Amino acid sequence: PLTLNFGSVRLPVSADGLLHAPTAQQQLGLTQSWEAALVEHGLPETYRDFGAGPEAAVSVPDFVALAFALDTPEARRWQKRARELLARAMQGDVRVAAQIAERNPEPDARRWLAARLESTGARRELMATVARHGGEGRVYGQLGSISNRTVLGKDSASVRQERGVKATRDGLTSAELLRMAYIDTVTARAIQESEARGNAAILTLHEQVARSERQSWERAGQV
Amino acid sequence: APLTLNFGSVRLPVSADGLLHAPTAQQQLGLTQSWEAALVEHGLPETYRDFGAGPEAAVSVPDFVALAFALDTPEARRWQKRARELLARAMQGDVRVAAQIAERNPEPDARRWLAARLESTGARRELMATVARHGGEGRVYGQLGSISNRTVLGDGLTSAELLRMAYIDTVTARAIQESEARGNAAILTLHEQVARSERQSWERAGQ
Structure with missing residues (x-):
């Protein structure tokens, strides 16, 4: 029984990071059946256990794309959260940085973060x-x-290229x-x-x- | 010294108090109109900051983001897309994103505050x-x-x-x-x- 805590919302989420589609529909104000939505939007038919047996699931990127396609009051709230997030990210807001790190399911990801922040220090x-x-x-x-x-x-360019990143760190x-x-x-x-x-x-x-x-x-x- | 706000591949000149150089914001958003035209059409404040070359027009980051969403140029759309990718990554708990955000805050107190809330380096x-x-x-x-x-x-x-x-x-x-x-x-x-x-x-x- 897991949730993705974002701002004020709690979205049920699977062990591998997909959202519970019924909840996603409520968050996006989608009102038609989920398969009506899968057909209309070209989304995969995929199931995950959120603690109550197999239920329709949707990836986070797909959720985000739907938020930016729909014009419901609900979808526009999510677009708003994306606007505020970018502003706060561009401004270095560490509270947002902490919230992001907390959402990561792997404790090891945060150990890496700490190593990065200290080497930057x-x-x-x-x-x-x-x-x-x-x-x-x-x-x-x-x-x-x-x-x-x-x-x-290797030079920083060699590594950026070799490892698939926009920045060495x-x-x-x-x-x-x-x-x-x-x-x-x-x-x-x-x-x-x-x-x-x-x-x-x-x-x-x-x-x-x-x-x-x-x-x-x-x-x-x-040695 | 002069400062730059780093966001992905983009480098935006930035004032000591966090405002972006407007002319560059205009290139990034595809705003080919004059800044005076833009100030009127979008309700933006008239603000000047020194980015190393004397006072030049400035725009806050929130205002920049609002323009990117308000506009529909290829360039604004790129920024709308960065915002979508950012949202997904933040919702997925991406620590490279959290690191990038913390590194954009120069204050040791902020970095210490963040490190203070994390598990150790492992x-x-x-x-x-x-x-x-x-x-x-x-x-x-x-x-x-x-x-x-x-x-x-x-x-x-x-x-x-x-x-x-x-x-x-x-x-x-x-x-x-x-x-x-x-x-x-x-x-x-x-x-x-x-x-x-x-x-x-x-x-x-x-x-």
Whole structure:
């Protein structure tokens, strides 16, 4: 017995993420029978157990498409939720980010999220330390380029292509994010204790940190 | 410095207080009319912000989104589509989306607030599991956690301490796998080595 909690609505959902169609019809103000709707809209005939035996199901994307096709008061409310969501997403609203993460059925997905957010925390801290210590455009990307090469082995474009992503960090493992997070934590220390200057050893130190990390990682397979 | 709002492949210049550069918003929405024409037709406020090149017209993100839905240009339709995909992905709990949203909020308090509501990074848990599949047993689960603590320390943790320990658990799990370590003795030895090296690097890189 599972629901997809979105804003104020609770939609019954299957183990594999499909919505209970009867509920979907109510949410979209669809009033005809479900097979009337399947025929009219070209939707699959598919069944899922929502705790009361086999019932008609609809994918989330299909639900969303129907919301953007129908003009019922109900459908227009869902279009409205899509407008508000995009605005809040574009603005970085972490409450929305939390709600999204909570809807994920896999605890492991959130462990990955935490790994990502912490490696980003570390990466930014390195940026902030770097700026405060002779900030120069070009340095920010030189630092990332070093990390990608040492941790992933390929340029960010190579990885974006190889792994099917629009951004490298959407395709990285927890381990890769943690290896990168570690390197940034170390470099930020070295400079803020070894007092480096400008864009030279701040890139010299980062190179040293990343290559040591690289060896440590390869060394784990030697030990 | 000048800022950009990143959304997928799109890069929108953005003011310090979150307003978008209007001329660029117009290219993104296919609004070929002048901005004055647009301000009148759509009820938008006249707002100027400095995006690095002196005051230029600005539009809020909510207003931008409303225009995308109000319009029916190929370009506005692209944005309507991004909104549909976003909705589906948010409803499905997509954590790459949640990550993208959190990364667009620059405030450490926001990121900390979000991290504070999540399970941990999982490095510790996954080490435990590797250890068990490699024949570890009993006390070893408690000993591995204690060894990391004496190395790094000596929610009250700093971010650096957290990452040092995540890093240590991550490396150990690898060392146990690439090596075909078996049993508690072998496992404890690897963990004590990884944790010693991490400590040395921390002190040494410091110098």
